[PDB]
UniProtKB/Swiss-Prot annotation, chain A:
It is an enzyme of class 1 (oxidoreductase). The gene is psaA. The PsaA/B heterodimer binds the P700 chlorophyll special pair and subsequent electron acceptors. PSI consists of a core antenna complex that captures photons, and an electron transfer chain that converts photonic excitation into a charge separation. The eukaryotic PSI reaction center is composed of at least 11 subunits. It comes from the Eukaryota. It is a multi-pass membrane protein. P700 is a chlorophyll a/chlorophyll a' dimer, A0 is one or more chlorophyll a, A1 is one or both phylloquinones and FX is a shared 4Fe-4S iron-sulfur center. The lineage of its organism: Eukaryota, Viridiplantae, Chlorophyta, core chlorophytes, Chlorophyceae. The chain crosses the membrane at residues 62-85, 148-171, 187-211, 283-301, 338-361, 377-403, 425-447, 522-540, 580-601, 652-674, 712-732. Belongs to the PsaA/PsaB family. Phylloquinone binds at W680. It comes from Chlamydomonas reinhardtii (Chlamydomonas smithii). GO terms for biological process: photosynthesis. This is Photosystem I P700 chlorophyll a apoprotein A1.
From Swiss-Prot, chain C:
One of its GO terms (biological process) is photosynthesis. This is Photosystem I reaction center subunit IX. The gene is psaJ. One of its GO terms (cellular component) is photosystem I. It is found in: Plastid, Chloroplast thylakoid membrane. Its main location: plastid. The chain crosses the membrane at residues 7-27. HAMAP family: PSI_PsaJ. It comes from Chlamydomonas reinhardtii. Belongs to the PsaJ family. PANTHER family: PHOTOSYSTEM I REACTION CENTER SUBUNIT IX, PTHR36082.
Amino acid sequence: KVKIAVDRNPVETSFEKWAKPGHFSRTLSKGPNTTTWIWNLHADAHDFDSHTSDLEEISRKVFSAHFGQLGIIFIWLSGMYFHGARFSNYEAWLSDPTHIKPSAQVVWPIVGQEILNGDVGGGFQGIQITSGFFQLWRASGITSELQLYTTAIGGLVMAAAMFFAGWFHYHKAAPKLEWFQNVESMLNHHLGGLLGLGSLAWAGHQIHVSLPVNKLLDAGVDPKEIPLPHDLLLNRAIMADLYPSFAKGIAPFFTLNWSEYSDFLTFKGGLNPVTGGLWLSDTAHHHVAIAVLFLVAGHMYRTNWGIGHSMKEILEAHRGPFTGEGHVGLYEILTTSWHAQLAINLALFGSLSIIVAHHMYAMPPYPYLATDYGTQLSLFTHHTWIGGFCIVGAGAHAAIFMVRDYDPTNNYNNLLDRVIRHRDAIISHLNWVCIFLGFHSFGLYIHNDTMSALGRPQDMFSDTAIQLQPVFAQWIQNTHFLAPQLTAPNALAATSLTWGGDLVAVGGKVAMMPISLGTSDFMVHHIHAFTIHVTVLILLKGVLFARSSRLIPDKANLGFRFPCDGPGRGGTCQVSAWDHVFLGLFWMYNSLSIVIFHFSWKMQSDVWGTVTGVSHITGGNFAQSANTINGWLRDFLWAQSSQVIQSYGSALSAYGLIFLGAHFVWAFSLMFLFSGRGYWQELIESIVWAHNKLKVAPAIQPRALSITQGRAVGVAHYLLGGIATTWSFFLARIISVG
Amino acid sequence: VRPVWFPGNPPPAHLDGSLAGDYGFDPLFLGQEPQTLKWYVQAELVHGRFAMLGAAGIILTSIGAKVGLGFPEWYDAGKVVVEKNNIDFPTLMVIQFYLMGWAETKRWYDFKNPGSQADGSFLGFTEEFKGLENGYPGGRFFDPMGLSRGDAAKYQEYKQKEVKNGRLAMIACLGFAAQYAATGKGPLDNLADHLADPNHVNFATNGVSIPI
Amino acid sequence: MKDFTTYLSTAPVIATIWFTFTAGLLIEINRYFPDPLVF
Amino acid sequence: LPGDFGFDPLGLLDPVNSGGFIEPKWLQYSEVIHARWAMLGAAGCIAPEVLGAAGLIPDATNIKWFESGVIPPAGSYNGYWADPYTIFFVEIVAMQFAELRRLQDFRYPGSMGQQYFLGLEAIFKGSGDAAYPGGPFFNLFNLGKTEAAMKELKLKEIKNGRLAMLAMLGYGAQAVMTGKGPFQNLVEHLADPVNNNILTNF
Ligand SMILES: CC1=C(C/C=C(\C)CCC[C@H](C)CCC[C@H](C)CCCC(C)C)C(=O)c2ccccc2C1=O
Ligand code: SF4
């Protein structure tokens, strides 16, 4: 029995507590007397579980917080669209994409920052963007900047609606706990409604707008010439001309003779030779498939009729001999804590964004997309960084739940309990497998560099001396290349020119080519896998030593975040799961940096270039300069640093400036990451003597930062410096050489 | 019970009815504090009076313009007359600012100290430079006709009609502004045209008001 | 409403306002008197 | 209450834990509003078609209903003594007045016959029930003589109103699919019950 439940006027709308800082905590609301008060106030503004302990209260809070997030996103989207409408060379780029470069951000003619207004073509000046909104919009079918304008207006309106909805569903008619707990209804509703109807309406928009106008653009007719979407909708005659099926309306579909609709529901595979994008009919068929799949999926669980399943019953039904009570109680834990959900969802989300990056560089779907190597690189590395961060956050909040809201009683002989039991065996095993991979993979590189600098390259590890071959990967590539003959006989081509095959180029520029795999790539993949396992080890220890330890048996009550347990029993610095997440974030940064370096060098060296054959931007130095560290440093880095270190007097001076600034702040973080607050407080005291002697001591007492505060500020600054440096370098270099 | 600008909704706290034109209209609560409220009262009064002035001047000059009497249109009268005579922008501006500053700072320090202006610190004067109400300095000069000192009911009615016509004049002056900035024309002329054809000579056809 | 005014007079808001004022002033100055070095 | 059949398979009239807009009062209020509208709208959408079919009106008028101007892309008509927008404006102001004061009634019951309104307040006192204020105008003739007849009449009103909502949707779907007029579809399906059908319209 499921229905709708709500409660009225739970909290008023007034500025009273707006004038009361720290009202949410009865602790802080009693006033400030020392500096660290401010830090704490900012720190725990959103720690809803420490605010109070009502599930329903925290729930209403997170609901309205979601609405705020949504409104912000709509705002920023409308901003992008309006900028594209009013300050862009988008219509010029529509006229010619191949030589006009996207530019929407313009600078003001002031003290000297106007030099950045780069001549991007189209008689236009400004700054090149990398986001790819141009190719996206062309793919969609936007021609008139009027469309961008109205789009931005609608986006702003939507943001306002989101904020209003948040205010309403928090202050006027708030829901109830069971209505938040109707999980089977929630899954049915999401999977059916949201995704099914999204893909369906998507297929519709593609078919009736974006397919015809893009057929026309690729046919080369004048852009503004092409008719209007509503005309395309109204006059069935035009669509009949384009695809002779349209004359028959819908009766043939109704009569189940689907084959006749194959004119624009295609299965080509491969790419579109005029734009380098994928076949729009193919993507439309794809989206139709996804639509029906998910809409059928949205009819699984029982809500108010016996038909459908019970998640908890299914859960308990799966029990094993080696496992004891199996999956019992999980339905409880999930129906009761936000943090479990947050951990699971962040993990999946990060992994998914990574897959998005990979798939997208693999099979470029937009027109003229493959051309801007800068845009490709930028999108890839950005989405990869975001994925890494989301996954680390998953780990963090997992451990946080485990400390806070776990209960032992409910789970006597659980999968969870027995895991907690043999945690020691597990962690030891992971340790060893890591150190093994580290040894072998990295010692290979050092052995190479030694065999080189010693004067005996005969004994290095390359494609020339003793070899190593990704036989498995080459085999898979072979098979996916030869698949359509027998495996998918109605497939007209491989789904990616990387499986093998010819070369598609546009505008004197390569769009794709079969990709080689060398001993270099073998070794790089293995370094990847090692650092990944190491990060996983850090986080798994961070979660499995949450409640207690063979060292600290009362870790649980001490909270999730704390500096140490004093110098006791030999010094207990850095023992909290919060510090676990700290160091895990460190190593995540390292790994992602290395992986995007791999990607960039492989692309630049052996895919990119211009057709004459092809002329690779570094001509292929990779497969011989990427298996020694000295070669790495010099030939790749110290090499490609050129344009970024000579970008002055040009619209690229900003990139060099930021390069410098990033080095600076990255180094600055180290003082924080190394110092100790006691010294800071002593120096503060001498400063207070100085001030006070003049009767200017502040009423707010000065206190050095808390230990964990020092740790957090250090890590934030360091990460910022590193990632900013590499970002500036990438952008300047690729925009210069492409 | 007083006619509430939004018939059906009750007035807020600070909006009571003691003042003229208390239709209960402050949906932004800008007058909760009495200091700020008396303040905005004086502001509204001076603005209404200025608007009444401006409307009268504009309309009379516009009539003089339509009739063949050579009077320019208001948005040009300034430049045209200053170039006609031997006037200097700087000297006119500076004298104007002098005199206005004097009178206006006197009104200011009166509002601050409600009585210290008829203290004989002037030439010899008193019982005239002393306020009567917040922004109602009717003495022997500001009310030389002496209606403030007779028939308090009639006087209340006069405050009411004053503030009514003041609000109307504010709205009408903004009217004039938009009329001209849109039609690039004379206000009275736009009037005559809409007379000629209300069905078609109107903002619906002005093609700017409604941007469709 | 007075609650709201005090919320305004809170510290970070006032800091932002004063800094915005100073920066806008400096910018307009460098506009109208470009590249001064002496006097 | 009137016209119920025990049919609420989705079950939203549940009066417990209600709030917001989901409250039987407001919900059935919206239902009766829609009923009266759809009745008027159906009568209108049809009238000129048959009115010119009988030829009683000059063929200048009786264009199909979706062309009278509401959608210029669907075709516009002209000859109106003023512009569509110039009419749209006074339409805005009149509907603003009517709807707003009806709403003020429903929100603060009885409180919309008090402010001086040219004596036009005694009628706006009405009942304490929206959608049924009655009063001298809104029940011009003293109808509901027997309260049994009164409930009977409420029932008949809701019946006809639901029928009207259905008919309006019918007009929409026909005029989009077959593109013709409503009376056109009628004349056709009359001519051929078999060969003038959506099966034939495939
Ligand atoms: C440098 C350093 C400090 C000293 C740094 C401190 C105390 C931070 C100072 C913050 C700013 C600079 C001062 C306060 C700024 C406020 C906005 C107040 C207004 C200031 C006006 C100028 C606007 C620590 O306290 C510390 C603690 C633990 C590990 C490492 C370190 C560490 O490395
Ligand atoms: S202050 Fe630092 S060194 Fe001292 S006990 Fe705490 S964590 Fe250890």
